[PDB]
């Protein structure tokens, strides 16, 4: 909802930013996010 999904080279940081994420996206801390479960969790077509 305001997010693009391109096959970017994603820099691999080491932060613990998984903690309280699936509950934080449900309440709406993030203004715009895309949840990709299953086949959508892919480095998309160029």
């Amino acid at each position: 909802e305001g997010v693009e999904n391109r096959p970017f080279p994603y820099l691999t940081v080491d932060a613990d930013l998984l903690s309280n994420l699936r509950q934080s996206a449900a309440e709406g801390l993030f203004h715009s996010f895309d949840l990709l479960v299953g086949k959508d969790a892919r480095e998309a077509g160029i």
Binding site: S24, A26, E27, G28, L29
Partner: protein, 98 residues
């Protein structure tokens, strides 16, 4: 759960409290006074925070989210300037008086 209200003269939708205190606050009102009951009686404020928890925590600190009083005056007025007026307020966050 053993009763519906402790008074029906203000808790009802069209009661006496919703006669005299449930008024939609506007910045250009002709009295301009500050009523501390308007945080408890506004239907537009009791349903203002029905959005999710983190999106209430976000709008709690980011702005003067609802009904502040003017400090350093003689009588309490509701603010219109808001430039140097920084204050936080839990009474609109949780809707309970002490």
């Amino acid at each position: 759960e053993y009763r519906s209200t402790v008074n029906p003269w203000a808790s009802q939708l069209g009661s006496l409290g919703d006669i005299m205190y449930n008024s939609s606050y506007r910045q250009t009102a002709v009295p301009g006074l500050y009523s501390p009951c308007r945080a408890f009686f506004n239907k537009e404020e009791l349903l203002r925070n029905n959005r999710g928890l983190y999106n209430m925590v976000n709008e709690y600190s980011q702005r003067l989210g609802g009904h502040p009083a003017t400090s350093n005056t003689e009588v309490q007025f509701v603010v219109i300037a808001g430039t140097d007026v920084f204050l936080e307020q839990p009474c609109s966050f949780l809707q309970e008086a002490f």
